[PDB]
């Protein structure tokens, strides 16, 4: 019953748990399906891992880069990260998939801000460039530090990475984050 190494998590080989991610982190990408309905079990493993979960947005190419853009700058806006419906947006802006134009898509991103009262990027001054900047470099610095290939996925204290394919539904995977920040 106790999680097993190799099975429901890994050890990373470079530990993050100096770099100041949240305690449990769900390492992510706009461009993921899974990842856009994963959000939909979001609230059952916060609530039986016991704790919020932050997160990460990964990079695999430089395509992604736009979305992790969009990404840090919706969450640099509000307080903690963007919630459910606000993800829902910017998943459905990213993934529009190949009858849409690079136009129609940037109109979507630019409306998930503006219908809740926020500031576009494209918008942004001075100083939220600087931000912006400073938080694509970060996730930049820790996702390639990371290794990480595989999302949707959960690091814990920046040194377990919990294998989802190790689990048969979301409350294993939130028994898994306990078991692993009851260490
Ligand atoms: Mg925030």
């Given at each position: 019953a106790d999680p097993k190494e190799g099975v429901q998590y890994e050890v990373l080989s470079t530990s993050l748990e100096n770099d100041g991610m949240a305690p449990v982190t769900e390492?992510?990408?706009?461009?993921?399906?899974?990842?856009?309905?994963?959000?939909?079990?979001?609230?059952?493993?916060?609530?039986?891992?016991?704790?919020?979960?932050?997160?990460?947005?990964?990079?695999?190419?430089?395509?992604?880069?736009?979305?992790?853009?969009?990404?840090?700058?919706?969450?640099?806006?509000?307080?903690?990260?963007?919630?459910?419906?606000?993800?829902?947006?910017?998943?459905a802006a990213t993934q529009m998939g190949e009858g849409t134009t690079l136009t129609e898509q940037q109109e979507a991103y630019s409306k998930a801000f503006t219908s809740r009262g926020l500031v576009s990027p494209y918008d942004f001054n001075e100083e939220q460039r600087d931000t912006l900047i400073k938080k694509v470099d970060n996730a930049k610095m820790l996702s390639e530090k990371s290794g990480i290939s595989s999302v949707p996925t959960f690091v814990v204290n920046g040194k377990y990475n919990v294998l989802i394919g190790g689990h048969d539904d979301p409350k294993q995977i939130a028994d898994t984050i306990r078991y692993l920040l009851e260490k």
């Open positions: 390492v992510f990408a706009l461009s993921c399906g899974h990842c856009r309905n994963m959000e939909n079990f979001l609230p059952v493993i916060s609530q039986e891992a016991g704790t919020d979960i932050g997160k990460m947005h990964i990079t695999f190419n430089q395509s992604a880069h736009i979305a992790s853009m969009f990404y840090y700058a919706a969450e640099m806006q509000v307080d903690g990260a963007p919630d459910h419906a606000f993800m829902e947006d910017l998943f």
